[PDB]
Structure formats: C-alpha cells, structure tokens
PDB file of all heavy atoms in Angstrom:
ATOM      1  N   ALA O   1       0.841  -1.195   0.000  1.00 34.48           N
ATOM      2  CA  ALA O   1       0.000   0.000   0.000  1.00 34.48           C
ATOM      3  C   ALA O   1       0.881   1.252   0.000  1.00 34.48           C
ATOM      4  O   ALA O   1       0.626   2.207  -0.728  1.00 34.48           O
ATOM      5  CB  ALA O   1      -0.901   0.025   1.283  1.00 34.48           C
ATOM      6  N   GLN O   2       1.895   1.247   0.870  1.00 33.19           N
ATOM      7  CA  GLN O   2       2.843   2.377   0.973  1.00 33.19           C
ATOM      8  C   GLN O   2       3.564   2.654  -0.353  1.00 33.19           C
ATOM      9  O   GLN O   2       3.690   3.790  -0.770  1.00 33.19           O
ATOM     10  CB  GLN O   2       3.875   2.087   2.067  1.00 33.19           C
ATOM     11  CG  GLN O   2       4.703   3.314   2.479  1.00 33.19           C
ATOM     12  CD  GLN O   2       5.624   3.013   3.707  1.00 33.19           C
ATOM     13  OE1 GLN O   2       5.397   2.073   4.484  1.00 33.19           O
ATOM     14  NE2 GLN O   2       6.653   3.793   3.852  1.00 33.19           N
ATOM     15  N   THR O   3       4.058   1.606  -0.986  1.00 35.44           N
ATOM     16  CA  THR O   3       4.728   1.709  -2.283  1.00 35.44           C
ATOM     17  C   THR O   3       3.839   2.439  -3.298  1.00 35.44           C
ATOM     18  O   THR O   3       4.346   3.263  -4.080  1.00 35.44           O
ATOM     19  CB  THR O   3       5.130   0.317  -2.795  1.00 35.44           C
ATOM     20  OG1 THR O   3       6.067  -0.258  -1.854  1.00 35.44           O
ATOM     21  CG2 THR O   3       5.766   0.424  -4.228  1.00 35.44           C
ATOM     22  N   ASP O   4       2.527   2.195  -3.217  1.00 35.89           N
ATOM     23  CA  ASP O   4       1.548   2.745  -4.193  1.00 35.89           C
ATOM     24  C   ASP O   4       0.969   4.085  -3.796  1.00 35.89           C
ATOM     25  O   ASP O   4       0.227   4.665  -4.561  1.00 35.89           O
ATOM     26  CB  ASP O   4       0.360   1.798  -4.439  1.00 35.89           C
ATOM     27  CG  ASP O   4       0.734   0.551  -5.168  1.00 35.89           C
ATOM     28  OD1 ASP O   4       1.739   0.528  -5.923  1.00 35.89           O
ATOM     29  OD2 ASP O   4       0.026  -0.463  -4.948  1.00 35.89           O
ATOM     30  N   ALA O   5       1.310   4.575  -2.609  1.00 32.69           N
ATOM     31  CA  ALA O   5       0.667   5.758  -2.055  1.00 32.69           C
ATOM     32  C   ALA O   5       0.960   7.035  -2.834  1.00 32.69           C
ATOM     33  O   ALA O   5       0.114   7.921  -2.880  1.00 32.69           O
ATOM     34  CB  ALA O   5       1.012   5.923  -0.588  1.00 32.69           C
ATOM     35  N   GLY O   6       2.138   7.127  -3.426  1.00 33.90           N
ATOM     36  CA  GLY O   6       2.527   8.357  -4.130  1.00 33.90           C
ATOM     37  C   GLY O   6       1.712   8.480  -5.421  1.00 33.90           C
ATOM     38  O   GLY O   6       1.117   9.527  -5.687  1.00 33.90           O
ATOM     39  N   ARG O   7       1.663   7.387  -6.198  1.00 34.58           N
ATOM     40  CA  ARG O   7       0.751   7.286  -7.404  1.00 34.58           C
ATOM     41  C   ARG O   7      -0.702   7.533  -7.037  1.00 34.58           C
ATOM     42  O   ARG O   7      -1.423   8.170  -7.792  1.00 34.58           O
ATOM     43  CB  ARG O   7       0.872   5.917  -8.055  1.00 34.58           C
ATOM     44  CG  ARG O   7       2.087   5.720  -8.963  1.00 34.58           C
ATOM     45  CD  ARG O   7       2.089   4.335  -9.617  1.00 34.58           C
ATOM     46  NE  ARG O   7       2.274   3.233  -8.667  1.00 34.58           N
ATOM     47  CZ  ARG O   7       3.458   2.805  -8.240  1.00 34.58           C
ATOM     48  NH1 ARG O   7       4.601   3.372  -8.673  1.00 34.58           N
ATOM     49  NH2 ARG O   7       3.517   1.799  -7.388  1.00 34.58           N
ATOM     50  N   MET O   8      -1.128   7.059  -5.856  1.00 31.35           N
ATOM     51  CA  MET O   8      -2.540   7.241  -5.390  1.00 31.35           C
ATOM     52  C   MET O   8      -2.948   8.691  -5.275  1.00 31.35           C
ATOM     53  O   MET O   8      -4.117   9.053  -5.512  1.00 31.35           O
ATOM     54  CB  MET O   8      -2.810   6.572  -4.064  1.00 31.35           C
ATOM     55  CG  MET O   8      -4.284   6.169  -3.885  1.00 31.35           C
ATOM     56  SD  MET O   8      -4.761   4.767  -4.933  1.00 31.35           S
ATOM     57  CE  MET O   8      -3.610   3.474  -4.379  1.00 31.35           C
ATOM     58  N   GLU O   9      -1.981   9.543  -4.953  1.00 28.85           N
ATOM     59  CA  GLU O   9      -2.274  10.971  -4.851  1.00 28.85           C
ATOM     60  C   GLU O   9      -2.915  11.572  -6.100  1.00 28.85           C
ATOM     61  O   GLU O   9      -3.756  12.463  -5.964  1.00 28.85           O
ATOM     62  CB  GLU O   9      -1.018  11.741  -4.547  1.00 28.85           C
ATOM     63  CG  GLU O   9      -1.333  13.181  -4.291  1.00 28.85           C
ATOM     64  CD  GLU O   9      -0.455  14.099  -5.094  1.00 28.85           C
ATOM     65  OE1 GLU O   9      -0.311  13.882  -6.326  1.00 28.85           O
ATOM     66  OE2 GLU O   9       0.111  15.030  -4.490  1.00 28.85           O
ATOM     67  N   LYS O  10      -2.461  11.157  -7.288  1.00 27.26           N
ATOM     68  CA  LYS O  10      -3.039  11.596  -8.587  1.00 27.26           C
ATOM     69  C   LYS O  10      -4.595  11.463  -8.647  1.00 27.26           C
ATOM     70  O   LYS O  10      -5.310  12.292  -9.238  1.00 27.26           O
ATOM     71  CB  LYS O  10      -2.332  10.863  -9.747  1.00 27.26           C
ATOM     72  CG  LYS O  10      -2.718  11.331 -11.194  1.00 27.26           C
ATOM     73  CD  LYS O  10      -2.035  10.462 -12.256  1.00 27.26           C
ATOM     74  CE  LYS O  10      -2.326  10.936 -13.704  1.00 27.26           C
ATOM     75  NZ  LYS O  10      -2.531   9.749 -14.616  1.00 27.26           N
ATOM     76  N   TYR O  11      -5.129  10.459  -7.967  1.00 25.17           N
ATOM     77  CA  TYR O  11      -6.538  10.156  -8.076  1.00 25.17           C
ATOM     78  C   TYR O  11      -7.365  10.609  -6.894  1.00 25.17           C
ATOM     79  O   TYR O  11      -8.524  10.243  -6.787  1.00 25.17           O
ATOM     80  CB  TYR O  11      -6.690   8.645  -8.322  1.00 25.17           C
ATOM     81  CG  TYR O  11      -5.840   8.215  -9.484  1.00 25.17           C
ATOM     82  CD1 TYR O  11      -4.732   7.368  -9.302  1.00 25.17           C
ATOM     83  CD2 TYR O  11      -6.096   8.722 -10.773  1.00 25.17           C
ATOM     84  CE1 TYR O  11      -3.941   6.984 -10.403  1.00 25.17           C
ATOM     85  CE2 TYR O  11      -5.316   8.359 -11.860  1.00 25.17           C
ATOM     86  CZ  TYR O  11      -4.241   7.500 -11.676  1.00 25.17           C
ATOM     87  OH  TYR O  11      -3.481   7.157 -12.802  1.00 25.17           O
ATOM     88  N   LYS O  12      -6.765  11.400  -5.994  1.00 26.22           N
ATOM     89  CA  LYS O  12      -7.423  11.880  -4.772  1.00 26.22           C
ATOM     90  C   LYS O  12      -8.797  12.487  -4.959  1.00 26.22           C
ATOM     91  O   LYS O  12      -9.702  12.164  -4.206  1.00 26.22           O
ATOM     92  CB  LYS O  12      -6.570  12.992  -4.129  1.00 26.22           C
ATOM     93  CG  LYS O  12      -5.692  12.577  -2.997  1.00 26.22           C
ATOM     94  CD  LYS O  12      -5.514  13.793  -2.055  1.00 26.22           C
ATOM     95  CE  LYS O  12      -5.192  13.396  -0.631  1.00 26.22           C
ATOM     96  NZ  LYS O  12      -6.154  12.384  -0.044  1.00 26.22           N
ATOM     97  N   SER O  13      -8.942  13.428  -5.918  1.00 25.15           N
ATOM     98  CA  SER O  13     -10.254  14.064  -6.131  1.00 25.15           C
ATOM     99  C   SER O  13     -11.313  13.032  -6.554  1.00 25.15           C
ATOM    100  O   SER O  13     -12.407  12.983  -5.987  1.00 25.15           O
ATOM    101  CB  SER O  13     -10.185  15.257  -7.083  1.00 25.15           C
ATOM    102  OG  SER O  13     -10.126  14.843  -8.416  1.00 25.15           O
ATOM    103  N   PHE O  14     -10.960  12.170  -7.508  1.00 27.64           N
ATOM    104  CA  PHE O  14     -11.870  11.063  -7.942  1.00 27.64           C
ATOM    105  C   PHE O  14     -12.227  10.130  -6.796  1.00 27.64           C
ATOM    106  O   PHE O  14     -13.423   9.890  -6.493  1.00 27.64           O
ATOM    107  CB  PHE O  14     -11.224  10.267  -9.092  1.00 27.64           C
ATOM    108  CG  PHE O  14     -10.799  11.098 -10.270  1.00 27.64           C
ATOM    109  CD1 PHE O  14      -9.930  10.560 -11.224  1.00 27.64           C
ATOM    110  CD2 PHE O  14     -11.298  12.401 -10.477  1.00 27.64           C
ATOM    111  CE1 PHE O  14      -9.548  11.293 -12.361  1.00 27.64           C
ATOM    112  CE2 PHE O  14     -10.907  13.152 -11.598  1.00 27.64           C
ATOM    113  CZ  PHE O  14     -10.020  12.611 -12.540  1.00 27.64           C
ATOM    114  N   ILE O  15     -11.203   9.606  -6.100  1.00 30.13           N
ATOM    115  CA  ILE O  15     -11.481   8.729  -4.979  1.00 30.13           C
ATOM    116  C   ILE O  15     -12.406   9.400  -3.952  1.00 30.13           C
ATOM    117  O   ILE O  15     -13.353   8.764  -3.456  1.00 30.13           O
ATOM    118  CB  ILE O  15     -10.185   8.218  -4.261  1.00 30.13           C
ATOM    119  CG1 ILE O  15      -9.352   7.331  -5.181  1.00 30.13           C
ATOM    120  CG2 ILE O  15     -10.537   7.486  -2.968  1.00 30.13           C
ATOM    121  CD1 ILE O  15      -7.822   7.218  -4.778  1.00 30.13           C
ATOM    122  N   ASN O  16     -12.137  10.664  -3.598  1.00 27.33           N
ATOM    123  CA  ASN O  16     -12.977  11.303  -2.571  1.00 27.33           C
ATOM    124  C   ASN O  16     -14.392  11.504  -3.070  1.00 27.33           C
ATOM    125  O   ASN O  16     -15.334  11.197  -2.358  1.00 27.33           O
ATOM    126  CB  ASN O  16     -12.393  12.645  -2.019  1.00 27.33           C
ATOM    127  CG  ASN O  16     -11.184  12.449  -1.103  1.00 27.33           C
ATOM    128  OD1 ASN O  16     -10.354  13.349  -0.982  1.00 27.33           O
ATOM    129  ND2 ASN O  16     -11.070  11.296  -0.483  1.00 27.33           N
ATOM    130  N   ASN O  17     -14.538  12.026  -4.282  1.00 26.97           N
ATOM    131  CA  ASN O  17     -15.875  12.194  -4.891  1.00 26.97           C
ATOM    132  C   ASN O  17     -16.667  10.890  -4.874  1.00 26.97           C
ATOM    133  O   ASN O  17     -17.776  10.818  -4.351  1.00 26.97           O
ATOM    134  CB  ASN O  17     -15.764  12.686  -6.333  1.00 26.97           C
ATOM    135  CG  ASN O  17     -15.528  14.184  -6.434  1.00 26.97           C
ATOM    136  OD1 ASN O  17     -15.752  14.779  -7.494  1.00 26.97           O
ATOM    137  ND2 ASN O  17     -15.096  14.806  -5.341  1.00 26.97           N
ATOM    138  N   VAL O  18     -16.067   9.850  -5.426  1.00 28.07           N
ATOM    139  CA  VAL O  18     -16.741   8.550  -5.510  1.00 28.07           C
ATOM    140  C   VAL O  18     -17.088   7.990  -4.100  1.00 28.07           C
ATOM    141  O   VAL O  18     -18.171   7.476  -3.878  1.00 28.07           O
ATOM    142  CB  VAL O  18     -15.922   7.574  -6.413  1.00 28.07           C
ATOM    143  CG1 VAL O  18     -16.512   6.187  -6.351  1.00 28.07           C
ATOM    144  CG2 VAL O  18     -15.923   8.094  -7.878  1.00 28.07           C
ATOM    145  N   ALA O  19     -16.155   8.099  -3.151  1.00 30.32           N
ATOM    146  CA  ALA O  19     -16.408   7.658  -1.787  1.00 30.32           C
ATOM    147  C   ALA O  19     -17.624   8.398  -1.160  1.00 30.32           C
ATOM    148  O   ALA O  19     -18.462   7.773  -0.466  1.00 30.32           O
ATOM    149  CB  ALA O  19     -15.174   7.885  -0.937  1.00 30.32           C
ATOM    150  N   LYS O  20     -17.687   9.712  -1.412  1.00 30.10           N
ATOM    151  CA  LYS O  20     -18.824  10.569  -0.994  1.00 30.10           C
ATOM    152  C   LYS O  20     -20.151  10.053  -1.535  1.00 30.10           C
ATOM    153  O   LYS O  20     -21.071   9.783  -0.752  1.00 30.10           O
ATOM    154  CB  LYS O  20     -18.623  12.032  -1.453  1.00 30.10           C
ATOM    155  CG  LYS O  20     -18.053  13.007  -0.396  1.00 30.10           C
ATOM    156  CD  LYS O  20     -17.963  14.508  -0.913  1.00 30.10           C
ATOM    157  CE  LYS O  20     -17.396  15.453   0.223  1.00 30.10           C
ATOM    158  NZ  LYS O  20     -16.905  16.884  -0.148  1.00 30.10           N
ATOM    159  N   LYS O  21     -20.226   9.902  -2.863  1.00 28.82           N
ATOM    160  CA  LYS O  21     -21.433   9.408  -3.589  1.00 28.82           C
ATOM    161  C   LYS O  21     -21.918   8.041  -3.099  1.00 28.82           C
ATOM    162  O   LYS O  21     -23.104   7.863  -2.793  1.00 28.82           O
ATOM    163  CB  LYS O  21     -21.159   9.364  -5.101  1.00 28.82           C
ATOM    164  CG  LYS O  21     -22.196   8.571  -5.951  1.00 28.82           C
ATOM    165  CD  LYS O  21     -21.777   8.518  -7.441  1.00 28.82           C
ATOM    166  CE  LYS O  21     -22.932   8.115  -8.367  1.00 28.82           C
ATOM    167  NZ  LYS O  21     -22.421   8.067  -9.769  1.00 28.82           N
ATOM    168  N   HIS O  22     -20.995   7.095  -2.960  1.00 31.81           N
ATOM    169  CA  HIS O  22     -21.346   5.725  -2.570  1.00 31.81           C
ATOM    170  C   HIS O  22     -21.356   5.429  -1.072  1.00 31.81           C
ATOM    171  O   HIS O  22     -21.775   4.359  -0.665  1.00 31.81           O
ATOM    172  CB  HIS O  22     -20.445   4.728  -3.310  1.00 31.81           C
ATOM    173  CG  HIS O  22     -20.654   4.747  -4.785  1.00 31.81           C
ATOM    174  ND1 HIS O  22     -21.821   4.301  -5.369  1.00 31.81           N
ATOM    175  CD2 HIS O  22     -19.874   5.201  -5.793  1.00 31.81           C
ATOM    176  CE1 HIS O  22     -21.743   4.460  -6.677  1.00 31.81           C
ATOM    177  NE2 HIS O  22     -20.566   4.994  -6.963  1.00 31.81           N
ATOM    178  N   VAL O  23     -20.889   6.375  -0.271  1.00 35.82           N
ATOM    179  CA  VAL O  23     -20.763   6.179   1.199  1.00 35.82           C
ATOM    180  C   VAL O  23     -19.815   4.993   1.515  1.00 35.82           C
ATOM    181  O   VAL O  23     -20.124   4.082   2.281  1.00 35.82           O
ATOM    182  CB  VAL O  23     -22.168   6.131   1.935  1.00 35.82           C
ATOM    183  CG1 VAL O  23     -22.007   6.443   3.432  1.00 35.82           C
ATOM    184  CG2 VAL O  23     -23.116   7.182   1.358  1.00 35.82           C
ATOM    185  N   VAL O  24     -18.654   5.023   0.853  1.00 34.67           N
ATOM    186  CA  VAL O  24     -17.622   3.988   0.998  1.00 34.67           C
ATOM    187  C   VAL O  24     -16.343   4.697   1.423  1.00 34.67           C
ATOM    188  O   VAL O  24     -15.983   5.718   0.841  1.00 34.67           O
ATOM    189  CB  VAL O  24     -17.405   3.244  -0.350  1.00 34.67           C
ATOM    190  CG1 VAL O  24     -16.099   2.414  -0.348  1.00 34.67           C
ATOM    191  CG2 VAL O  24     -18.614   2.365  -0.649  1.00 34.67           C
ATOM    192  N   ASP O  25     -15.647   4.146   2.412  1.00 32.72           N
ATOM    193  CA  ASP O  25     -14.375   4.737   2.847  1.00 32.72           C
ATOM    194  C   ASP O  25     -13.396   4.892   1.677  1.00 32.72           C
ATOM    195  O   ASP O  25     -13.161   3.943   0.938  1.00 32.72           O
ATOM    196  CB  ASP O  25     -13.771   3.876   3.954  1.00 32.72           C
ATOM    197  CG  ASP O  25     -12.807   4.638   4.825  1.00 32.72           C
ATOM    198  OD1 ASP O  25     -11.902   5.333   4.276  1.00 32.72           O
ATOM    199  OD2 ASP O  25     -12.991   4.544   6.068  1.00 32.72           O
ATOM    200  N   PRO O  26     -12.845   6.097   1.464  1.00 31.63           N
ATOM    201  CA  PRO O  26     -11.860   6.218   0.424  1.00 31.63           C
ATOM    202  C   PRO O  26     -10.662   5.297   0.553  1.00 31.63           C
ATOM    203  O   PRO O  26     -10.021   5.000  -0.456  1.00 31.63           O
ATOM    204  CB  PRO O  26     -11.370   7.652   0.542  1.00 31.63           C
ATOM    205  CG  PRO O  26     -12.048   8.231   1.703  1.00 31.63           C
ATOM    206  CD  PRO O  26     -13.147   7.388   2.098  1.00 31.63           C
ATOM    207  N   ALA O  27     -10.324   4.924   1.788  1.00 31.33           N
ATOM    208  CA  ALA O  27      -9.229   4.015   2.035  1.00 31.33           C
ATOM    209  C   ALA O  27      -9.500   2.632   1.415  1.00 31.33           C
ATOM    210  O   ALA O  27      -8.573   1.949   0.967  1.00 31.33           O
ATOM    211  CB  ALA O  27      -8.958   3.913   3.556  1.00 31.33           C
ATOM    212  N   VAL O  28     -10.764   2.231   1.399  1.00 29.68           N
ATOM    213  CA  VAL O  28     -11.157   0.957   0.774  1.00 29.68           C
ATOM    214  C   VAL O  28     -11.019   1.029  -0.768  1.00 29.68           C
ATOM    215  O   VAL O  28     -10.539   0.097  -1.389  1.00 29.68           O
ATOM    216  CB  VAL O  28     -12.600   0.550   1.223  1.00 29.68           C
ATOM    217  CG1 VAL O  28     -13.111  -0.676   0.479  1.00 29.68           C
ATOM    218  CG2 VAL O  28     -12.629   0.308   2.752  1.00 29.68           C
ATOM    219  N   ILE O  29     -11.448   2.143  -1.360  1.00 30.01           N
ATOM    220  CA  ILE O  29     -11.225   2.382  -2.786  1.00 30.01           C
ATOM    221  C   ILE O  29      -9.742   2.380  -3.119  1.00 30.01           C
ATOM    222  O   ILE O  29      -9.320   1.673  -4.069  1.00 30.01           O
ATOM    223  CB  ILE O  29     -11.903   3.701  -3.258  1.00 30.01           C
ATOM    224  CG1 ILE O  29     -13.424   3.596  -3.003  1.00 30.01           C
ATOM    225  CG2 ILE O  29     -11.576   3.992  -4.757  1.00 30.01           C
ATOM    226  CD1 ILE O  29     -14.227   4.922  -3.084  1.00 30.01           C
ATOM    227  N   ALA O  30      -8.949   3.144  -2.336  1.00 30.55           N
ATOM    228  CA  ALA O  30      -7.514   3.192  -2.585  1.00 30.55           C
ATOM    229  C   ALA O  30      -6.904   1.785  -2.452  1.00 30.55           C
ATOM    230  O   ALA O  30      -6.066   1.384  -3.257  1.00 30.55           O
ATOM    231  CB  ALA O  30      -6.793   4.240  -1.674  1.00 30.55           C
ATOM    232  N   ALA O  31      -7.383   1.006  -1.508  1.00 27.48           N
ATOM    233  CA  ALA O  31      -6.830  -0.352  -1.322  1.00 27.48           C
ATOM    234  C   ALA O  31      -7.067  -1.280  -2.529  1.00 27.48           C
ATOM    235  O   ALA O  31      -6.195  -2.106  -2.910  1.00 27.48           O
ATOM    236  CB  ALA O  31      -7.424  -0.965  -0.074  1.00 27.48           C
ATOM    237  N   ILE O  32      -8.263  -1.183  -3.099  1.00 27.00           N
ATOM    238  CA  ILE O  32      -8.594  -1.950  -4.311  1.00 27.00           C
ATOM    239  C   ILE O  32      -7.744  -1.499  -5.493  1.00 27.00           C
ATOM    240  O   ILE O  32      -7.232  -2.343  -6.270  1.00 27.00           O
ATOM    241  CB  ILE O  32     -10.143  -1.895  -4.601  1.00 27.00           C
ATOM    242  CG1 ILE O  32     -10.889  -2.654  -3.509  1.00 27.00           C
ATOM    243  CG2 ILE O  32     -10.471  -2.504  -5.966  1.00 27.00           C
ATOM    244  CD1 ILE O  32     -12.390  -2.414  -3.500  1.00 27.00           C
ATOM    245  N   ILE O  33      -7.577  -0.181  -5.633  1.00 26.30           N
ATOM    246  CA  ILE O  33      -6.732   0.407  -6.703  1.00 26.30           C
ATOM    247  C   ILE O  33      -5.305  -0.105  -6.567  1.00 26.30           C
ATOM    248  O   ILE O  33      -4.659  -0.475  -7.570  1.00 26.30           O
ATOM    249  CB  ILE O  33      -6.756   1.977  -6.722  1.00 26.30           C
ATOM    250  CG1 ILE O  33      -8.162   2.514  -7.142  1.00 26.30           C
ATOM    251  CG2 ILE O  33      -5.624   2.545  -7.630  1.00 26.30           C
ATOM    252  CD1 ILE O  33      -8.382   4.021  -6.928  1.00 26.30           C
ATOM    253  N   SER O  34      -4.802  -0.156  -5.333  1.00 24.30           N
ATOM    254  CA  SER O  34      -3.465  -0.694  -5.100  1.00 24.30           C
ATOM    255  C   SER O  34      -3.360  -2.190  -5.430  1.00 24.30           C
ATOM    256  O   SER O  34      -2.464  -2.614  -6.182  1.00 24.30           O
ATOM    257  CB  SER O  34      -3.057  -0.424  -3.649  1.00 24.30           C
ATOM    258  OG  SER O  34      -1.866  -1.089  -3.300  1.00 24.30           O
ATOM    259  N   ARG O  35      -4.263  -2.992  -4.880  1.00 22.84           N
ATOM    260  CA  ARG O  35      -4.282  -4.439  -5.184  1.00 22.84           C
ATOM    261  C   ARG O  35      -4.426  -4.736  -6.693  1.00 22.84           C
ATOM    262  O   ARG O  35      -3.667  -5.540  -7.261  1.00 22.84           O
ATOM    263  CB  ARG O  35      -5.402  -5.107  -4.396  1.00 22.84           C
ATOM    264  CG  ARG O  35      -5.596  -6.635  -4.608  1.00 22.84           C
ATOM    265  CD  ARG O  35      -4.301  -7.525  -4.461  1.00 22.84           C
ATOM    266  NE  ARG O  35      -4.656  -8.896  -4.909  1.00 22.84           N
ATOM    267  CZ  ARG O  35      -4.538 -10.012  -4.188  1.00 22.84           C
ATOM    268  NH1 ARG O  35      -4.001  -9.993  -2.963  1.00 22.84           N
ATOM    269  NH2 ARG O  35      -4.929 -11.162  -4.738  1.00 22.84           N
ATOM    270  N   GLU O  36      -5.427  -4.141  -7.319  1.00 23.47           N
ATOM    271  CA  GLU O  36      -5.782  -4.460  -8.707  1.00 23.47           C
ATOM    272  C   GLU O  36      -4.751  -4.019  -9.764  1.00 23.47           C
ATOM    273  O   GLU O  36      -4.447  -4.804 -10.649  1.00 23.47           O
ATOM    274  CB  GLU O  36      -7.152  -3.884  -9.056  1.00 23.47           C
ATOM    275  CG  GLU O  36      -8.337  -4.513  -8.318  1.00 23.47           C
ATOM    276  CD  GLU O  36      -8.653  -5.920  -8.759  1.00 23.47           C
ATOM    277  OE1 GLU O  36      -8.000  -6.429  -9.692  1.00 23.47           O
ATOM    278  OE2 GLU O  36      -9.577  -6.517  -8.180  1.00 23.47           O
ATOM    279  N   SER O  37      -4.191  -2.807  -9.658  1.00 24.03           N
ATOM    280  CA  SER O  37      -3.278  -2.305 -10.707  1.00 24.03           C
ATOM    281  C   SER O  37      -2.038  -1.601 -10.160  1.00 24.03           C
ATOM    282  O   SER O  37      -1.286  -0.997 -10.919  1.00 24.03           O
ATOM    283  CB  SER O  37      -4.037  -1.288 -11.610  1.00 24.03           C
ATOM    284  OG  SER O  37      -4.336  -0.091 -10.890  1.00 24.03           O
ATOM    285  N   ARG O  38      -1.816  -1.677  -8.855  1.00 22.74           N
ATOM    286  CA  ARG O  38      -0.737  -0.924  -8.214  1.00 22.74           C
ATOM    287  C   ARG O  38      -0.868   0.553  -8.573  1.00 22.74           C
ATOM    288  O   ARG O  38       0.113   1.155  -8.975  1.00 22.74           O
ATOM    289  CB  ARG O  38       0.648  -1.432  -8.649  1.00 22.74           C
ATOM    290  CG  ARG O  38       0.857  -3.005  -8.568  1.00 22.74           C
ATOM    291  CD  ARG O  38       0.487  -3.550  -7.206  1.00 22.74           C
ATOM    292  NE  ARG O  38       1.147  -2.875  -6.102  1.00 22.74           N
ATOM    293  CZ  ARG O  38       2.292  -3.271  -5.543  1.00 22.74           C
ATOM    294  NH1 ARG O  38       2.981  -4.324  -6.030  1.00 22.74           N
ATOM    295  NH2 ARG O  38       2.800  -2.551  -4.554  1.00 22.74           N
ATOM    296  N   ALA O  39      -2.068   1.124  -8.430  1.00 21.36           N
ATOM    297  CA  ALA O  39      -2.330   2.536  -8.862  1.00 21.36           C
ATOM    298  C   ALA O  39      -1.820   2.863 -10.260  1.00 21.36           C
ATOM    299  O   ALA O  39      -1.231   3.956 -10.523  1.00 21.36           O
ATOM    300  CB  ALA O  39      -1.849   3.539  -7.831  1.00 21.36           C
ATOM    301  N   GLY O  40      -2.141   1.945 -11.171  1.00 19.46           N
ATOM    302  CA  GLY O  40      -1.868   2.087 -12.601  1.00 19.46           C
ATOM    303  C   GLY O  40      -0.498   1.603 -13.068  1.00 19.46           C
ATOM    304  O   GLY O  40      -0.265   1.481 -14.253  1.00 19.46           O
ATOM    305  N   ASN O  41       0.413   1.273 -12.147  1.00 15.91           N
ATOM    306  CA  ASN O  41       1.780   0.967 -12.526  1.00 15.91           C
ATOM    307  C   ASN O  41       1.936  -0.257 -13.396  1.00 15.91           C
ATOM    308  O   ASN O  41       2.838  -0.303 -14.249  1.00 15.91           O
ATOM    309  CB  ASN O  41       2.685   0.852 -11.266  1.00 15.91           C
ATOM    310  CG  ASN O  41       4.171   1.059 -11.591  1.00 15.91           C
ATOM    311  OD1 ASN O  41       4.545   2.082 -12.135  1.00 15.91           O
ATOM    312  ND2 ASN O  41       4.997   0.104 -11.255  1.00 15.91           N
TER     313      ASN O  41
END
C-alpha cells in the first residue's frame, strides 16, 4: 500500500468524490486500486 501511495495521490479528487457518492471509505477504494493495478503501474 505504501509503495503505491505516491501514485494514489493523482486520483485523490476522484477517490474522494466517488467515496462521498457511494458512502464507501476512500481508504477501501484506494486499497482496491493498489491491489488491482498498483495505482496504474
């Protein structure tokens, strides 16, 4: 998760918006992004 945290910053506005709309912790969204694609890497 830490390794991917710097890349995760790029998507902060999207993650927060989406977390707001769906009532889902942004940390859970960020965790899936890290697991699934390493934040795009």
Side-chain angles (χ1 to χ4, degrees):
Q2 193 173 339
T3 298
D4 291 335
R7 280 182 293 275
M8 207 72 59
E9 186 230 48
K10 186 184 183 219
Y11 308 113
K12 261 209 155 308
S13 79
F14 306 165
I15 295 158
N16 287 154
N17 279 198
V18 172
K20 262 184 179 166
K21 167 183 197 181
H22 295 292
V23 201
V24 165
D25 203 311
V28 173
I29 300 166
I32 293 167
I33 292 168
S34 171
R35 179 51 189 237
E36 293 289 357
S37 69
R38 311 308 307 267
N41 202 57

